[PDB]
Design a binder for these strands. Structure first.
Ligand code: SF4
Ligand SMILES: [Mg+2]
Ligand SMILES: [Mg+2]
Ligand SMILES: [Mg+2]
Ligand SMILES: [Mg+2]
Ligand SMILES: [Mg+2]
Ligand SMILES: [Mg+2]
Ligand SMILES: [Mg+2]
Ligand SMILES: [Mg+2]
Ligand SMILES: [Mg+2]
Ligand SMILES: [Mg+2]
Ligand SMILES: [Mg+2]
Ligand SMILES: [Mg+2]
Ligand SMILES: [Mg+2]
Ligand SMILES: [Mg+2]
Ligand SMILES: [Mg+2]
Ligand SMILES: [Mg+2]
Ligand SMILES: [Mg+2]
Ligand SMILES: [Mg+2]
Ligand SMILES: [Mg+2]
Ligand SMILES: [Mg+2]
Ligand SMILES: [Mg+2]
Ligand SMILES: [Mg+2]
Ligand SMILES: [Mg+2]
Ligand SMILES: [Mg+2]
Ligand SMILES: [Mg+2]
Ligand SMILES: [Mg+2]
Ligand SMILES: [Mg+2]
Ligand SMILES: [Mg+2]
Ligand SMILES: [Mg+2]
Ligand SMILES: [Mg+2]
Ligand SMILES: [Mg+2]
Ligand SMILES: [Mg+2]
Ligand SMILES: [Mg+2]
Ligand SMILES: [Mg+2]
Ligand SMILES: [Mg+2]
Ligand SMILES: [Mg+2]
Ligand SMILES: [Mg+2]
Ligand SMILES: [Mg+2]
Ligand SMILES: [Mg+2]
Ligand SMILES: [Mg+2]
Ligand SMILES: [Mg+2]
Ligand SMILES: [Mg+2]
Ligand SMILES: [Mg+2]
Ligand SMILES: [Mg+2]
Ligand SMILES: [Mg+2]
Ligand SMILES: [Mg+2]
Ligand SMILES: [Mg+2]
Ligand SMILES: [Mg+2]
Ligand SMILES: [Mg+2]
Ligand SMILES: [Mg+2]
Ligand SMILES: [Mg+2]
Ligand SMILES: [Mg+2]
Ligand SMILES: [Mg+2]
Ligand SMILES: [Mg+2]
Ligand SMILES: [Mg+2]
Ligand SMILES: [Mg+2]
Ligand SMILES: [Mg+2]
Ligand SMILES: [Mg+2]
Ligand SMILES: [Mg+2]
Ligand SMILES: [Mg+2]
Ligand SMILES: [Mg+2]
Ligand SMILES: [Mg+2]
Ligand SMILES: [Mg+2]
Ligand SMILES: [Mg+2]
Ligand SMILES: [Mg+2]
Ligand SMILES: [Mg+2]
Ligand SMILES: [Mg+2]
Ligand SMILES: [Mg+2]
Ligand SMILES: [Mg+2]
Ligand SMILES: [Mg+2]
Ligand SMILES: [Mg+2]
Ligand SMILES: [Mg+2]
Ligand SMILES: [Mg+2]
Ligand SMILES: [Mg+2]
Ligand SMILES: [Mg+2]
Ligand SMILES: [Mg+2]
Ligand SMILES: [Mg+2]
Ligand SMILES: [Mg+2]
Ligand SMILES: [Mg+2]
Ligand SMILES: [Mg+2]
Ligand SMILES: [Mg+2]
Ligand SMILES: [Mg+2]
Ligand SMILES: [Mg+2]
Ligand SMILES: [Mg+2]
Ligand SMILES: [Mg+2]
Lengths: 231, 137, 148, 208
RNA sequence: AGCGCCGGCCAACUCCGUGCCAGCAGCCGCGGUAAUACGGAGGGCGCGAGCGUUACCCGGAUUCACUGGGCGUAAAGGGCGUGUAGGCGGCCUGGGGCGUCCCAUGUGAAAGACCACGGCUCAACCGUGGGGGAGCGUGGGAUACGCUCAGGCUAGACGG
RNA sequence: CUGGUCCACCCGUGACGCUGAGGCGCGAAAGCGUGGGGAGCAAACCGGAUUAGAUACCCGGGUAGUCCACGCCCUAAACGAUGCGCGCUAGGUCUCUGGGUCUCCUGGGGGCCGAAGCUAACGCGUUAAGCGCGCCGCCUGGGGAGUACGGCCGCAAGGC
């Protein structure tokens, strides 16, 4: 699936706010902006995907991590596609290291489903139907992708390892592999399966997350093709 | 620059602690014989007589362990520890009977004898002593 | 299962208006006497809780020490802060020559013959910590050759 | 000289039975059978955790009290073992088990090491024919510990050798009963004697 | 059969007496009317013809740190240059072989220390036998490093 | 009139180097000597307030001194409380000053934030407090005390 027309989609960005450990994935600086060795992207992407399919083919789940407003909606698109958990809003410290306890929070969301389903005493004073529905909508805003996760993942897919350094910090604390899409402002050594590429253009994020899902769905039996993408 | 031998050991140590593929040291026949042993014992991949700006150097190719899993990916070193022993301020010489055993055996002591630069194991075989240059593990 | 040994139980205090209010700290080492040992420090508002909480982290922080006939392979020296620990291999009829703190860690990891020495600050916490990192860096003739 | 006072209080203190009398040690009248708690006003009070120093001291006193030997002679035997070759622990027990009064006890000549001492001390024992009244005599492999001929017609040694006619001894020993004489074959192992004593703790006591 | 000790360090706890008194005390500290810390008693711990005390030496004290420490704020960078002695010093080659390394040889008394055996009934004590070493004299040998002598070089330094 | 220093050229010399016990020179202010000068300011001093008092803070006066020449004194929170030299170990940003080809690159300074690492922590971090070599100075519990005695220096104060 490893398209080579990613050059039309990103070839990296970000001038000199770089991280000198990312020098091994740079070709030069065009406008004074750091531009990525797409071949280095290619080679890593192949090794990166070789890990992903292997994990799908064994029924392993992959928690997708993206909060920056660019990747935020599309990590919801592509992870709902793959039927696999995401976190698009505020990342919650301890979503891995304190999983059992944040997982005590989705249980509460679960019971507000079987409560606001009906009809279990709507004879609660109108303060309550107003209050719990607020809590419900709130719980829904942050846990809509995490509730799908019922146990420590086997990998996490991050779109900015600098932005999501907390999640990387938890997953590494738990020996969980970390695949990610990094550009020049990120620390490579902290990620296990690298995708060196622009992580600010929705262009790049879509071409990487969707093709990542395409490997996920195909390695779970029965393929499918084009999926959403705003112009 | 008062001690080229300690400058080379330190160039390596500063290079290995940041995980360089290589680092260049100013060249000399005594230095090569010292690197000759670091290769023949696996502390380095080896070296090559390169030149920089017209000056003879020694490009030493470093070697590390497998990447690690956890909060610290950085891999274990192969030269955990290398330090000068005999110095310009205090020459150190041992006879064959007093040659020390670096790290119970897992480490090498590098000596200069009148049969050439030798490890402590080599030196005990040939039965000679000399100036205790350094120790590595 | 794992044998536990309390090493340190101290009471710290903190000040407020109205007076001081305490808290307890538990230094616990766990091990099997076969090559597996862990150290954890536990703090809680009462002694038994902190003791139990310390046993918990001790299992979440272990180290396999390459026992060889009941001694360590090579001598090692580690500094943790201002505390320094020295360990030296020793033959069968030796024993475990160590202060109370490092003795507990070596004993539960199966070490039966070792010479040790504390130097620098003898703070039990930092000494216990320095003994773990010393065991953690012990290496066999195998790993030596594996690296080269 | 040796400790000569009440001997059941030792067992009650050490928390184990030390067979310091022979006969009553197996009866229901044994102190550890009736009051298995330390002597004195506070014996029946709840014990608090002993310090590491207490532990090692208790083990050392347990080992020492077993032989009824002085701390001086005890420590000297230990120091010899520490300077001796190999493992101090084994050698210590070995040199302990090589005392004449101890071998005389092991051979069933006497029901207690105290009795053995008074037997040796009163000269009722010989070593390789040669009479020896020294409790601290060191027996060596190949020796022979016999009852004195001018004492063979003694009630106490008679009843005791009666009760030994087919009783085993340590592998390192033999006993020709009826002839009233045995042999010291070899210096024992720790395996050959399951004394209720971890000896390493005694090493650690003296290493402070 | 006695002597020390039983607040923590440090092994061994209770009752009375006393009430910041009398007293204890190696350090930290005990005593102001329920003192495991003073005094006695019962009990307990430790040793035993000894047990404690005082003095002194080494240890613990990597607390003069060669092994094996330090100096921004803990004790500790000289107020700053300049420079004498001294300490230390770059790349390549050859001579010498002072240091250094190796071999041989002489010396390294006896006693003591150590390993084995043996003699006093054991031990102490004692006898017999066993293995060395550093260091220094001598002869022989090595030359990487340091030194010295000689010849080159330009990366230090100095000058145009 | 004169010192240091940086840059470009890579032209000359050929390790001529680093450090530096002693020595010698420099050394803020206050102070001293001889002479001059004296507006402002201002120890001492006098007076008014303030205040319970106010030998102070505040106010009105005011002499040394502050200024110049020459000669002494030689101290300091003389501080970055951080000796000098060399080599090595991510970067980002502001700035002074040179040379490019002037996008930027590259030297030499001066700051800030930080990689690895160090540190008891605070913090340091290519201007190290990192990793190493050389050499010098210095510390070894608080007080007594930078005191006494001695010696050397000073006109004295007083310094070492
Ligand atoms: S009777 Fe029991 S308590 Fe008394 S000496 Fe014998 S074994 Fe010990
Ligand atoms: Mg980005
Ligand atoms: Mg040395
Ligand atoms: Mg291991
Ligand atoms: Mg410490
Ligand atoms: Mg330190
Ligand atoms: Mg060994
Ligand atoms: Mg200390
Ligand atoms: Mg202390
Ligand atoms: Mg028995
Ligand atoms: Mg124990
Ligand atoms: Mg031994
Ligand atoms: Mg008779
Ligand atoms: Mg028994
Ligand atoms: Mg001792
Ligand atoms: Mg005593
Ligand atoms: Mg009290
Ligand atoms: Mg004691
Ligand atoms: Mg006690
Ligand atoms: Mg009175
Ligand atoms: Mg009372
Ligand atoms: Mg007392
Ligand atoms: Mg009392
Ligand atoms: Mg006696
Ligand atoms: Mg005496
Ligand atoms: Mg002393
Ligand atoms: Mg000392
Ligand atoms: Mg030193
Ligand atoms: Mg110190
Ligand atoms: Mg200075
Ligand atoms: Mg001074
Ligand atoms: Mg010289
Ligand atoms: Mg040289
Ligand atoms: Mg030469
Ligand atoms: Mg030559
Ligand atoms: Mg020579
Ligand atoms: Mg000799
Ligand atoms: Mg002799
Ligand atoms: Mg004999
Ligand atoms: Mg010797
Ligand atoms: Mg010679
Ligand atoms: Mg020359
Ligand atoms: Mg030059
Ligand atoms: Mg020039
Ligand atoms: Mg030129
Ligand atoms: Mg020339
Ligand atoms: Mg100078
Ligand atoms: Mg000077
Ligand atoms: Mg001046
Ligand atoms: Mg002035
Ligand atoms: Mg003046
Ligand atoms: Mg005056
Ligand atoms: Mg005057
Ligand atoms: Mg004047
Ligand atoms: Mg005058
Ligand atoms: Mg005047
Ligand atoms: Mg005037
Ligand atoms: Mg006035
Ligand atoms: Mg007034
Ligand atoms: Mg008045
Ligand atoms: Mg006034
Ligand atoms: Mg005024
Ligand atoms: Mg005025
Ligand atoms: Mg005046
Ligand atoms: Mg005047
Ligand atoms: Mg001066
Ligand atoms: Mg300043
Ligand atoms: Mg400066
Ligand atoms: Mg100063
Ligand atoms: Mg100070
Ligand atoms: Mg200096
Ligand atoms: Mg220094
Ligand atoms: Mg510039
Ligand atoms: Mg310009
Ligand atoms: Mg700069
Ligand atoms: Mg900073
Ligand atoms: Mg860091
Ligand atoms: Mg340091
Ligand atoms: Mg910088
Ligand atoms: Mg650099
Ligand atoms: Mg600078
Ligand atoms: Mg420092
Ligand atoms: Mg003092
Ligand atoms: Mg003075
Ligand atoms: Mg003064
Ligand atoms: Mg004077």
């Amino acid at each position: 699936v490893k398209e080579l027309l990613e050059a039309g989609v990103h070839f990296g960005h970000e001038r000199k706010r770089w991280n000198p450990k990312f020098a091994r994935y740079i070709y030069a600086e065009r406008n004074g902006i750091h531009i990525i060795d797409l071949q280095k992207t290619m080679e890593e992407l192949e090794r990166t995907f070789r890990f992903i399919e292997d994990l799908a083919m064994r029924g392993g789940t992959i928690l997708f991590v993206g909060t920056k407003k660019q990747a935020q909606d599309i990590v919801r698109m592509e992870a709902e596609r793959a039927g696999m958990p995401y976190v698009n809003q505020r990342w919650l410290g301890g979503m891995l290291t304190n999983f059992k306890t944040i997982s005590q929070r989705v249980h509460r969301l679960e019971e507000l489903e079987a409560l606001f389903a009906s009809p279990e005493i709507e004879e609660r004073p109108k303060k309550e139907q107003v209050r719990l529905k607020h809590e419900l909508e709130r719980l829904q805003k942050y846990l809509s992708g995490f509730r799908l996760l019922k146990r420590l993942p086997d990998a996490i897919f991050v779109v900015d390892p600098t932005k999501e350094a907390i999640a990387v910090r938890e997953a590494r604390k738990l020996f969980i592999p970390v695949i990610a899409l990094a550009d020049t402002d990120s620390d490579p050594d902290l990620v296990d399966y690298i995708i060196p590429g622009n992580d600010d253009a929705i262009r790049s994020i879509q071409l990487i997350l969707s093709r990542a899902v395409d490997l996920i769905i195909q390695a779970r039996g029965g393929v499918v093709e084009p999926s959403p993408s705003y112009a | 620059l008062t001690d080229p031998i300690a400058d080379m050991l330190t160039r390596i140590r500063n290079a290995t602690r940041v995980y360089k593929e290589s680092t260049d040291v100013p060249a000399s026949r005594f230095k090569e014989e010292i690197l000759r042993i670091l290769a023949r014992e696996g502390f380095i991949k080896g070296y090559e007589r390169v030149d920089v700006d017209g000056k003879p150097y020694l490009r030493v190719y470093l070697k590390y362990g497998p990447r690690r899993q956890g909060p610290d990916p950085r891999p274990e070193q192969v030269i955990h520890h290398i330090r000068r022993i005999s110095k310009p301020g205090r020459r150190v010489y041992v006879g064959v009977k007093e040659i020390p055993r670096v790290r119970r055996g897992l480490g090498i002591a590098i000596l200069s004898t009148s049969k050439g630069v030798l490890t402590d194991r080599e030196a005990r075989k040939l039965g000679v002593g000399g100036e205790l240059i350094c120790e590595v593990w | 299962d794992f044998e536990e040994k309390m090493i340190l139980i101290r009471r710290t205090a903190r000040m407020q208006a109205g007076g001081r209010r305490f808290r307890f700290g538990a230094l616990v080492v766990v091990g099997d006497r076969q090559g597996r040992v862990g150290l954890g420090f536990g703090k809680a508002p009462e002694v038994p809780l902190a003791v139990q909480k310390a046993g918990y982290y001790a299992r979440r922080n272990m180290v396999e020490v390459p026992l060889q006939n009941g001694t360590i392979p090579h001598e090692i020296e580690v500094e943790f802060g201002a505390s320094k620990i020295v360990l030296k291999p020793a033959a069968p009829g030796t024993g475990v020559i160590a202060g109370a703190v490092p003795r507990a860690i070596l004993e539960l990891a199966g070490v039966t013959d070792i010479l040790t020495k504390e130097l620098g600050s003898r703070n039990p916490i930092n000494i216990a910590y320095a003994t773990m990192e010393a065991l953690r860096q012990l290496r066999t003739k195998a790993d030596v050759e594996r690296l080269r | 000289g040796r400790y000569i006072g009440p001997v059941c209080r030792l067992c009650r203190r050490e928390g184990v039975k030390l067979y310091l009398k022979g006969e009553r040690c197996y009866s229901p009248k044994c102190a550890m059978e009736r009051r298995p708690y330390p002597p004195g006003q506070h014996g029946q009070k709840r014990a608090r955790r002993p310090s590491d120093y207490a532990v090692r001291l208790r083990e050392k006193q347990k080992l020492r009290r077993i032989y009824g030997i002085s701390e001086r002679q005890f420590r000297n035997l230990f120091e010899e073992a520490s300077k001796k070759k190999g493992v101090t622990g084994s050698v210590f027990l070995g040199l302990l088990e090589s005392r004449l009064d101890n071998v005389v006890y092991r051979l069933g000549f006497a029901v207690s090491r105290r009795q053995a001492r008074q037997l040796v001390r009163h000269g009722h024992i010989t070593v390789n024919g040669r009479r020896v009244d020294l409790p601290s005599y060191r027996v060596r492999p190949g020796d022979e510990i016999a009852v004195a001929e001018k004492s063979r017609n003694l009630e106490l040694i008679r009843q005791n050798l009666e009760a030994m006619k087919g009783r085993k001894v340590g592998p390192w020993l033999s006993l020709d009963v009826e002839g009233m004489k045995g042999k010291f074959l070899r210096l024992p192992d720790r395996e050959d004697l399951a004394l209720p004593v971890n000896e390493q703790l005694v090493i650690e006591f003296y290493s402070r």
